[PDB]
């Protein structure tokens, strides 16, 4: 339900990269640039980019190639 | 503000009273009375927070959803001190603090006040949720002990709950599960601490 | 005077057996009070069927070892005591079993007898026993009157409720109640707690209108 | 033995023994009300004695803040128990019920003191006056004409408590502000509105007014109010001695 | 045993008997200043 | 000109009590009189230490 | 730091967390309460004294 | 003295709960202390 | 910050309403008082510009005067609010 | 399932009174019990003083000149007054008092719609030259009502319309000549003698019924 950002970080297990790919990815959804793929969950920006990344459908190349 | 512990808090959030997240959040709230299409000028906008109607604080718990604040005591002397916690919205002038996370701000409740600080970049928000966040610092910076263990309170309530009683009310009894066993507890057939004979699934 | 009351109701179903439904708009002094009378009816009053006596062959006593079988003899007892089996003919009947994996599907049962769970295990194989259920009323036990065994007559297995806060913005104060129950797969939990409204009503009836 | 008893003063007759020849039931116990006091604090005197009483040297005929017939009464008592429930008490901190507030027993009183002062500027010398420009309906309803709040209003946050004028020039009228008095039809004021006001989050009620005024100066219709309301009350005070 | 104690009588433990009644306890100001300002006016000061 | 004010502070959760033996404390939260633990006569308690 | 180091961290805040319910449930339940006879004198502290 | 007001000189009792109804396993102590309220109120100390 | 923020929004409103209002009625205020940036001019100034009738020019200043009051009252903004 | 149809109701004074419930099953002889005490309670309907306006003081903090005690205490004793009201929920009385005496809970001037139970309530005591004449403002409400919530020379009171003092309730075996299971419940009650306690029982079942009609 809510979003993990505990175990999304034991995937990546950098804990400092993983911020650097979500911002990059929460100003698109803020600036209207791109849709999210999950569901909105009635969250803001900063909740939403978290999931994504422990869900494996954005990554750094691939928040790269949608701008 | 002055401290309150408060028991029906999670552990990833703690309380914040209306009239200081009216303050705090001030510019918040006029950035959505614009979008929404209720008040186009900034200046009526300003008249309706100051009045407090309804619609403020629709808003107001609308703008305060997952957004993390900072709390710190007065003096700090490690990286425990500053810890992000969800702001929910209470009733009253004193901030709510979880009664798990008071061995890590050496504070008591005698009297002692806490900073609080709103963080406003998106970077911000991500960093408070990663790093600074209560449900990630629980291990001690010293040694690989938790400093969220069970405090004084609520260990002592654990103490006389694992307890063995040589004559007491419901023993030699034989229980199926471990729903069926609180059944029988609830009842008043059964004692707290009695010799029986369970059956677990682990 | 006139409270704040919720005419509609959201019930929340996670299993079959498990359900979760709350109650968002309640007064203060009306929050936990409600918690507690649900709570002591639904596991001290309430109608059900379960089995009270059990006659083995060939076992004088609890304890003492069986041959033919691989569980123990205390572990029979445990067994059975999660059965779930409805009378609706006779208050009380006498099931007997006869089998030398014991099923509880392999019971020789009656037109007036029903039962739900067929998948049930008794014991293993490595059967000559006479199972006595009737009704009661909650949890009693077989001190207060392999012969005497815990009878659970009541369906509902756990009753848990917290009470939180709620958010409105009229009172600004109120407090909302979530309540968890658990069913042995006879009846669901949506009528297992709308009965429990009803005995309760059926005792203030005649007092005041 | 105690003459005549009141909630202002208490006067007593002095016996015929431990007296002068001359004016001998001469003694006059005025009670001082609610005075601030230096930590914001009421100070009052209740009497506990009644007419027809005979009391001697060294008895207590009125007790202060804090004092109950003579015995120190700092706090209050109530029924106290010794278990953890819920929580609440954790560490120190203290679960109370709705008794000890619906009874009203901790409730105090503050006294608060705000004090306005009429300088001299280089620019123009003016002194108090009420009439300010700049202001609505809702103020003058409240404000008198002297330029005074009335004893025993609702002063809230927001309300003006006197009227000081602060005279100025050179305004420098921006474009937007011509736009402005324009669409509004009133004349252009250059006098400021500078008068004190209660500040954020505090409300109370005025219970007494003070004025002072230096030597030589002509006395307004506030200095006269309060003067002949202070020499009435000694007058009537004397002639009931007497 | 004066008027004032006829409406409330308070119950003491104390077993010792009493010699010496506490003293005024502000003594140590009233007679200190006293002396400053010597109001008495006889021959020799 | 000098004008006082009269406040009335009633006490609300957060202020800070104590007792004669340096025994700090904060009220938490004010409960009903339901809630509170009373006897077999019915005289609840008002503060729980 | 056993359950930190064998199921993860997201089952640890939950455990973490309903410990301190269950404590303080079955805590108010309870009648602790320090009183005058609770501080028990033994009787050979004459002896050792005299 | 708590003999001559017919109370229990062990000056402990069991007390019912008011929310579950329950009674406590372990009686209680109950009693009259002196409180005092001290100049800290929070009207003076919440700022933002 | 919030008081510099308040004179932005009122400032660009000013010059969106006397857009969005008729083409005349708003170039007569816009010489007169200088709200859209142009140098001010009196009334004996504007008058060989627009209309040498002194008395004409000045009818349809009350006109735009009371357009400009009738579209803040509606606007959601409080005349009385705005000094306070 | 046999359920009471009459209500047994015990006096044995103006304000505490006893009430039994015999025919009760085990299991919710002990439920009810419970749950009746926290609804008489919190919600009661009751009356008391809310506002008051005296017109020789200007505000609260002022005292009368021919009076003993402060305004203040005057405005404390004036709100242990247990008011009855029958008809109408906002009535205005009036008092009036000149002279030496004692001002007592019959000097108010009395009504139809109104019925004052205690008159042994002292207000102030007054002197020869002390005369007061104010006039007291009722209204009916639920539950505790600050000043906050709720010209000049009017004083705003803190009214509590709670009529209820202390609750009990006791649990014994009563037989029926069926089973030794039935116990009836006693319960006893403690008000200010504003309400009648058999009628306080059918307040509090109707309450209880709205509720669980809901669920
Ligand atoms: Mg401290």
Redesign the interface.
Same mark, same amino acid.
């Given at each position: 339900a809510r =979003?993990? =950002?505990?175990?999304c $970080?034991?995937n990546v297990d950098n804990?400092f990269e993983? =911020?650097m790919l +979500?911002?990059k990815r +929460?100003?698109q959804l803020?600036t209207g640039g791109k849709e999210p793929k999950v569901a909105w969950e009635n969250?803001?920006?900063? =909740?939403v +980019? $978290?999931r994504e990344i422990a869900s494996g459908l954005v990554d750094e190349n691939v928040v790269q190639q949608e701008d | 503000s002055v401290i309150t512990v408060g028991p029906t808090l999670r552990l990833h959030q703690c309380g914040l009273p209306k009239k200081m997240a009216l303050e705090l959040f001030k510019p918040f709230i006029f950035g959505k009375l614009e979008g929404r299409g209720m008040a186009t000028t900034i200046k009526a906008a300003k008249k309706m927070v100051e009045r407090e109607l309804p619609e403020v604080w629709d808003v107001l718990a609308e703008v305060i959803? %997952?957004?993390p604040v900072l709390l710190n005591r007065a003096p700090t002397l490690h990286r425990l001190g500053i810890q992000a916690f969800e702001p929910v919205l209470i009733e009253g002038k004193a901030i709510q603090l979880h009664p798990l996370v008071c061995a890590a701000y050496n504070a008591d409740f005698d009297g002692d006040q806490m900073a609080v600080h709103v963080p406003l970049t998106? %970077?911000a928000?991500? %960093?408070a949720?990663?790093?600074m966040?209560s449900?990630?610092n629980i291990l001690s910076p010293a040694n690989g002990e938790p400093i969220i263990v069970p405090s004084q309170d609520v260990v002592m309530g654990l103490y006389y709950m694992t307890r063995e009683a040589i004559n007491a009310k419901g023993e030699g009894m034989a229980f199926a599960d471990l729903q069926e066993v609180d059944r029988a507890y609830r009842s008043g057939q059964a004692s707290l601490h009695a010799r029986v004979k369970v059956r677990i699934n682990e | 005077n006139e409270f704040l009351t919720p005419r509609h109701i959201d019930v929340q179903v996670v299993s079959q057996t498990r359900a979760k439904i709350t109650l968002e708009p309640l007064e203060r002094g009306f929050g936990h009070t409600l918690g507690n009378a649900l709570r002591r009816i639904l596991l001290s009053s309430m109608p059900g069927c379960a089995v009270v006596e059990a006659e083995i062959d060939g076992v004088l006593h609890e304890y003492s070892a069986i041959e033919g079988v691989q569980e123990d003899v205390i572990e029979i007892l445990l067994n059975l005591k999660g059965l779930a089996i409805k009378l609706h003919g006779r208050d009380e009947v006498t099931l007997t079993l006869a089998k030398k994996v014991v099923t509880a599907a392999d019971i020789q049962l009656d037109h007036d007898v029903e039962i739900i769970n067929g998948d049930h295990v008794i014991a293993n194989l490595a059967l000559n026993m006479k199972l006595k259920v009737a009704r009661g009323r909650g949890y009693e036990p077989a001190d207060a009157r392999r012969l005497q065994l815990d009878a659970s007559f009541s369906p509902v297995r756990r009753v848990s409720y917290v009470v939180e806060n709620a958010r409105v913005e009229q009172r600004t104060n109120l407090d909302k109640l979530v309540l968890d129950l658990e069913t042995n797969g006879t009846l669901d939990p949506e009528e297992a707690i709308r009965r429990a409204a009803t005995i309760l009503q059926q005792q203030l009836a005649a007092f005041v209108d | 033995v105690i003459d005549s008893v009141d909630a202002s003063r208490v006067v007593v007759r002095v016996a015929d023994d431990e007296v002068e020849t001359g004016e001998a039931g001469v003694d006059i116990y005025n009670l001082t009300k609610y005075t601030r006091s230096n930590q914001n604090t009421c100070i009052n005197q209740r009497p506990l004695v009644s007419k027809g009483d005979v009391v001697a040297r060294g008895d207590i005929l009125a007790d202060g803040p804090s004092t109950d017939m003579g015995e120190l009464a700092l706090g209050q008592n109530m029924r106290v128990a010794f278990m953890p429930w819920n929580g609440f008490n954790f560490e120190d901190s203290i679960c109370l019920s709705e008794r000890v507030v619906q009874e009203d027993r901790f409730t105090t009183i503050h006294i608060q003191e705000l004090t306005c002062v009429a300088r001299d500027t280089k620019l123009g010398p003016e002194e108090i006056t009420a009439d300010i420009p700049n202001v609505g309906e809702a103020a003058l309803n409240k404000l008198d004409e002297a330029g005074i709040v009335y004893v025993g209003a609702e002063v809230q946050a927001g309300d003006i408590l006197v009227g000081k004028v602060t005279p100025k020039g050179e305004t420098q009228l921006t474009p937007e502000e011509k736009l402005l008095r324009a669409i509004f039809g009133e004349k252009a004021s250059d006098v400021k509105d500078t008068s004190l006001r209660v500040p954020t989050g505090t409300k109370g009620t005025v219970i007494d007014v003070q004025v002072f005024t230096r030597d030589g100066v002509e006395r307004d219709s506030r200095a006269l109010s309060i003067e002949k309301m202070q020499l009435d009350q000694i007058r009537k005070d004397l002639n009931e001695e007497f | 045993y004066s008027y004032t104690e006829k409406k409330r009588i308070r119950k003491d433990f104390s077993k010792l008997p009493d010699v010496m009644d506490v003293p005024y306890l502000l003594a140590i100001q009233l007679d200190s200043y006293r002396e400053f300002l010597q109001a008495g006016a006889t021959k020799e000061q | 000109v000098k004008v006082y004010l009269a406040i009335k502070r009633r006490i609300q959760p957060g202020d800070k009590m104590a007792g004669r033996h340096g025994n700090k404390g904060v009220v938490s939260v004010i409960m009903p009189v339901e809630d509170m633990p009373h006897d077999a006569n019915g005289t609840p308690v008002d503060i729980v230490l | 730091n056993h359950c930190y180091r064998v199921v993860?961290?997201?089952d640890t805040?939950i455990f973490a967390d309903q410990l301190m319910y269950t404590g303080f449930a079955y805590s108010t339940i309870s009648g602790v309460s320090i009183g005058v006879n609770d501080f028990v004198i033994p009787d050979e502290k004459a002896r050792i004294i005299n | 003295m708590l003999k001559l007001a017919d109370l229990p000189e062990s000056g402990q009792m069991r007390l019912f709960d008011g929310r579950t109804g329950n009674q406590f396993e372990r009686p209680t102590t109950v009693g009259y202390m002196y409180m005092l309220k001290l100049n800290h109120l929070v009207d003076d100390k919440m700022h933002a | 910050p919030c008081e510099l923020l308040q004179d932005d929004d009122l400032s660009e409103s000013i010059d969106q309403w006397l857009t969005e209002l008729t083409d005349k009625q708003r170039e007569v205020v816009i010489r007169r008082f200088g709200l859209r940036g142009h140098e001010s001019s009196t009334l004996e100034e504007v008058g060989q510009e627009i209309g040498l009738t002194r008395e004409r020019v000045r009818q349809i200043q009350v006109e735009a005067l009371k357009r400009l009051r009738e579209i803040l009252e509606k606007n959601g903004l409080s005349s009385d609010a705005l000094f306070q």
């Amino acid at each position: 339900a809510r =979003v993990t =950002v505990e175990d999304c $970080l034991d995937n990546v297990d950098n804990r400092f990269e993983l =911020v650097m790919l +979500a911002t990059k990815r +929460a100003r698109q959804l803020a600036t209207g640039g791109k849709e999210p793929k999950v569901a909105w969950e009635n969250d803001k920006p900063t =909740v939403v +980019a $978290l999931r994504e990344i422990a869900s494996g459908l954005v990554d750094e190349n691939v928040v790269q190639q949608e701008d | 503000s002055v401290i309150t512990v408060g028991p029906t808090l999670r552990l990833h959030q703690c309380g914040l009273p209306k009239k200081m997240a009216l303050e705090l959040f001030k510019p918040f709230i006029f950035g959505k009375l614009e979008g929404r299409g209720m008040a186009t000028t900034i200046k009526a906008a300003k008249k309706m927070v100051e009045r407090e109607l309804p619609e403020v604080w629709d808003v107001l718990a609308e703008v305060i959803r %997952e957004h993390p604040v900072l709390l710190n005591r007065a003096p700090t002397l490690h990286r425990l001190g500053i810890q992000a916690f969800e702001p929910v919205l209470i009733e009253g002038k004193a901030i709510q603090l979880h009664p798990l996370v008071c061995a890590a701000y050496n504070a008591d409740f005698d009297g002692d006040q806490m900073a609080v600080h709103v963080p406003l970049t998106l %970077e911000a928000q991500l %960093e408070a949720r990663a790093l600074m966040m209560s449900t990630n610092n629980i291990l001690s910076p010293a040694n690989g002990e938790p400093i969220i263990v069970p405090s004084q309170d609520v260990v002592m309530g654990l103490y006389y709950m694992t307890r063995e009683a040589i004559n007491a009310k419901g023993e030699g009894m034989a229980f199926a599960d471990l729903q069926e066993v609180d059944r029988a507890y609830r009842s008043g057939q059964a004692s707290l601490h009695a010799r029986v004979k369970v059956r677990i699934n682990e | 005077n006139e409270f704040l009351t919720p005419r509609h109701i959201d019930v929340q179903v996670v299993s079959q057996t498990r359900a979760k439904i709350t109650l968002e708009p309640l007064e203060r002094g009306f929050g936990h009070t409600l918690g507690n009378a649900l709570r002591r009816i639904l596991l001290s009053s309430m109608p059900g069927c379960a089995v009270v006596e059990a006659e083995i062959d060939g076992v004088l006593h609890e304890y003492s070892a069986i041959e033919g079988v691989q569980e123990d003899v205390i572990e029979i007892l445990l067994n059975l005591k999660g059965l779930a089996i409805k009378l609706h003919g006779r208050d009380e009947v006498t099931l007997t079993l006869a089998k030398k994996v014991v099923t509880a599907a392999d019971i020789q049962l009656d037109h007036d007898v029903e039962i739900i769970n067929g998948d049930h295990v008794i014991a293993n194989l490595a059967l000559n026993m006479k199972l006595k259920v009737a009704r009661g009323r909650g949890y009693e036990p077989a001190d207060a009157r392999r012969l005497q065994l815990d009878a659970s007559f009541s369906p509902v297995r756990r009753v848990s409720y917290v009470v939180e806060n709620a958010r409105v913005e009229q009172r600004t104060n109120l407090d909302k109640l979530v309540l968890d129950l658990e069913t042995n797969g006879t009846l669901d939990p949506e009528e297992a707690i709308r009965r429990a409204a009803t005995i309760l009503q059926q005792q203030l009836a005649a007092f005041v209108d | 033995v105690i003459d005549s008893v009141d909630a202002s003063r208490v006067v007593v007759r002095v016996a015929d023994d431990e007296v002068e020849t001359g004016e001998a039931g001469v003694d006059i116990y005025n009670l001082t009300k609610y005075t601030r006091s230096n930590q914001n604090t009421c100070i009052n005197q209740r009497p506990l004695v009644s007419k027809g009483d005979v009391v001697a040297r060294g008895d207590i005929l009125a007790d202060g803040p804090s004092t109950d017939m003579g015995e120190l009464a700092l706090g209050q008592n109530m029924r106290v128990a010794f278990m953890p429930w819920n929580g609440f008490n954790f560490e120190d901190s203290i679960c109370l019920s709705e008794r000890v507030v619906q009874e009203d027993r901790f409730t105090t009183i503050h006294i608060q003191e705000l004090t306005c002062v009429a300088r001299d500027t280089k620019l123009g010398p003016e002194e108090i006056t009420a009439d300010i420009p700049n202001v609505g309906e809702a103020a003058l309803n409240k404000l008198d004409e002297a330029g005074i709040v009335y004893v025993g209003a609702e002063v809230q946050a927001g309300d003006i408590l006197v009227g000081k004028v602060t005279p100025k020039g050179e305004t420098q009228l921006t474009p937007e502000e011509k736009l402005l008095r324009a669409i509004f039809g009133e004349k252009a004021s250059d006098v400021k509105d500078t008068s004190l006001r209660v500040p954020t989050g505090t409300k109370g009620t005025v219970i007494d007014v003070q004025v002072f005024t230096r030597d030589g100066v002509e006395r307004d219709s506030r200095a006269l109010s309060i003067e002949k309301m202070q020499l009435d009350q000694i007058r009537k005070d004397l002639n009931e001695e007497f | 045993y004066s008027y004032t104690e006829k409406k409330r009588i308070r119950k003491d433990f104390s077993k010792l008997p009493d010699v010496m009644d506490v003293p005024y306890l502000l003594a140590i100001q009233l007679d200190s200043y006293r002396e400053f300002l010597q109001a008495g006016a006889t021959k020799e000061q | 000109v000098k004008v006082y004010l009269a406040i009335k502070r009633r006490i609300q959760p957060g202020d800070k009590m104590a007792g004669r033996h340096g025994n700090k404390g904060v009220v938490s939260v004010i409960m009903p009189v339901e809630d509170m633990p009373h006897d077999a006569n019915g005289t609840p308690v008002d503060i729980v230490l | 730091n056993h359950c930190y180091r064998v199921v993860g961290l997201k089952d640890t805040v939950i455990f973490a967390d309903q410990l301190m319910y269950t404590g303080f449930a079955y805590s108010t339940i309870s009648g602790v309460s320090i009183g005058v006879n609770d501080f028990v004198i033994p009787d050979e502290k004459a002896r050792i004294i005299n | 003295m708590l003999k001559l007001a017919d109370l229990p000189e062990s000056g402990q009792m069991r007390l019912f709960d008011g929310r579950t109804g329950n009674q406590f396993e372990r009686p209680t102590t109950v009693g009259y202390m002196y409180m005092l309220k001290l100049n800290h109120l929070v009207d003076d100390k919440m700022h933002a | 910050p919030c008081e510099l923020l308040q004179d932005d929004d009122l400032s660009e409103s000013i010059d969106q309403w006397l857009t969005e209002l008729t083409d005349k009625q708003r170039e007569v205020v816009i010489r007169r008082f200088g709200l859209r940036g142009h140098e001010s001019s009196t009334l004996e100034e504007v008058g060989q510009e627009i209309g040498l009738t002194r008395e004409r020019v000045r009818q349809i200043q009350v006109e735009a005067l009371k357009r400009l009051r009738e579209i803040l009252e509606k606007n959601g903004l409080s005349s009385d609010a705005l000094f306070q």
